[PDB]
Symmetry: D3
Subunit: 133 residues, 6 copies
């Protein structure tokens, strides 16, 4: 049993895909244990969330996008939730994400990619602490 | 432009219908203004929400059901959102709710009926204040 | 609590709509009590099922259609299942069946109308005995 | 057997609902006879299509909206296709369109209402001649 | 042209996924040629069905689960039905089943995995004989 | 940004899958820039479209199938549309097409395979010129 942190990104709101994305996770039998709606996430939480990318060329654009609309932060619980939801999510690169995955079916950009999911036990604990202190 | 209060009820969680219900409202182009997840809503909140039903025979059973699992409280915004979301919701009674509505397609019980939606401007203001006192 | 008899008709098989129809009933929380698949139902069974239509002009065409492909006979159980599944089914006439109903969304003919559902407690008992004599 | 003229309106493209709408008609077993994609329909065509509305206050806004993005014009064929597709379409007014209909499920505005469908045999002939003069 | 034996497992009934599963197979153009509903399958048919697993640690739990609710046994027919429906089914292990497969999208447990499908020509003939003697 | 040529094949019309197929592409955020409905495509356009296959054993059957019902020709536009829509399409061979792809989920024959999509920049330009001269 694990908990993982998911963000529904602003593009999902723009494209009316919030329920589509949450529903794929729900259908896999993962349970919501915490959830918050952000009309606009604070810049600082975004920058901490993506702190590992702070020196990357895309950092400012990434942060700007992430505050360009609402987000939902969700903690999901289930056996091996971290790796399983990562598999549902699909590759960051739209040249690679597989049909059947969230990004494979729905995302068409490396940045506007609909969903964040924690990538490891340690990052899940960190991200949960950021969004649900 | 109106705001209405929606509750996703514990049966929606039990039956894995949360996204199905939220998706129906989303597809109609209503926007989420506020949203809160409750692992278990306090009974007092439920009693306030349903204060008008306090003398009904089902009142205690209703409150028990509403604290039996999680709830999501959502404020939706849109033109005439109150009446429109009520029409999407469907009638309380499973003998009446129309196919095409949330309850008509998905609910089979008068109590376990998946979704609350404010029924008037007055009650919306009241219910939003209960679930989102801030 | 009631039991009703449903037939998935040969047009549902031809149009690959079997799961679509069954899924609508499943999503409403009705439970399967008995189910039988018929590669081709015996004409006598069809004539008994529709005995009340024996003097109608369409009777032979109706029987021909019903043996033209497979049928699934299902007994569903639930509170007020008979009237509820009738409302999900929709009116026989394509000029009347409502969007949101099975026939309203999917059927375009008065005869090739995808689904049978018992219309009363009396007929349910009768039809269940025809399809599930055991 | 009838033919009716359907327009998929620019809001359907903006909201990525083209296939959703076309799919509802397809699932009802109507057949496409002719179809044209317009990156932007000429304003004159729109004015002719809606000539009966020329004195209405919304006429210019309606024409502006109709040229604001792509349109697909489709001729559908089927028994009583005109009235049937009108029932699937749903009422113009978001306070009235029924859950289960295209507009009832998906449209939230009196103007941005996703779909046109001919309302009579006379208007179908007229509209088909506008969009498919050949 | 082949026939294969599918079981819709009790978890599909519990989670109201019977039509979802049958529909994926139907949409692939496979045809039902036989079908039976079991309110509760006889223990002995289950034990014969899974006879190869009789000495495995999970055997008793597997059999208990399989009689814990209804099942549907279905014979499907189509060109290369056996391998094709196996591909639709997805890996037994939820760490491996691919998004887009039945188990990949819907199952979250190695045991409660929604669907059985014959794995070979010989096992299909055997399983069909068990469920449709 | 690229344009690619898609054909919705006659089997999609027969099986009422036109919107299902177009919808998968629409949900991936590709935009229609040209589209024509053919009640019956001219034999010569089909033979030119598939000119590379003219000496293959299946050529006549392929062409006969392609004129056996309506088709829709569509030009889709988007970043890397050619490879992305090819990935959505899935392998020609039903023993290989992956669940989650159009063919993987819906097609059950090597010939009756629902959809054509250009396989390269050069073939896209050629096919667009055939269907939209
Ligand atoms: N424009 C651009 N954005 C990028 C690139 N790599 C990552 N990003 C953005 C989008 C990602 O969702 C986010 C975090 O990157 P990540 O942890 O490697 O990706 P992921 O866990 O969201 O799949 O940063 C990139 O190469 N280009
Ligand atoms: N068991 C039972 N419960 C009832 C009955 N009427 C109402 N309830 C419960 C379920 C309703 O969702 C809740 C509030 O009643 P309401 O305001 O008349 O209905 P609604 O706005 O949820 O459609 O009380 C009733 O007659 N029997
Ligand atoms: N061609 C034709 N067939 C008809 C007509 N009325 C009924 N039928 C056929 C189709 C019906 O499913 C079947 C039984 O008629 P019913 O009991 O009045 O309708 P229903 O309970 O299936 O809605 O007989 C009719 O008017 N014309
Ligand atoms: N803003 C506005 N637009 C309107 C109103 N009534 C009609 N329209 C626009 C939207 C309609 O799709 C179009 C044609 O009107 P119609 O023939 O009465 O409606 P309909 O056949 O599209 O349902 O004109 C109206 O009252 N207000
Ligand atoms: N708990 C548990 N159950 C298992 C394990 N391996 C197999 N099973 C159960 C679930 C399988 O559906 C069933 C038959 O095993 P199988 O033939 O290797 O799997 P499959 O053909 O259902 O994918 O036995 C296992 O390793 N642990
Ligand atoms: N019967 C048969 N038909 C074939 C075979 N290979 C190709 N075809 C037909 C179906 C294909 O959609 C069409 C073009 O072949 P292709 O370019 O290798 O396939 P694809 O780009 O449609 O996946 O020719 C084949 O091996 N057998
Ligand atoms: Mg990451
Ligand atoms: Mg109320
Ligand atoms: Mg009747
Ligand atoms: Mg009109
Ligand atoms: Mg096996
Ligand atoms: Mg090719």
């Amino acid at each position: 049993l694990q908990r993982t942190l998911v963000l529904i990104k602003p593009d999902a709101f723009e494209r009316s895909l919030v329920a589509e994305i949450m529903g794929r996770i729900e259908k896999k039998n993962f349970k919501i244990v915490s959830m918050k709606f952000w009309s606009k996430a604070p810049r600082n939480l975004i920058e901490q969330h993506y702190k590992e990318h702070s020196e990357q060329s895309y950092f400012n654009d990434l942060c700007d996008f992430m505050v360009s609309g609402p987000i939902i932060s969700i903690v999901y619980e289930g056996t091996d939730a971290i790796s399983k939801i990562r598999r549902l999510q699909g590759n960051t690169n739209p040249l690679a994400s597989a049909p059947g995955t969230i990004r494979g079916d729905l995302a068409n950009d490396i940045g506007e990619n609909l969903i964040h999911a924690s990538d490891s036990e340690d990052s899940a604990v960190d991200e949960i602490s950021i969004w649900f202190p």
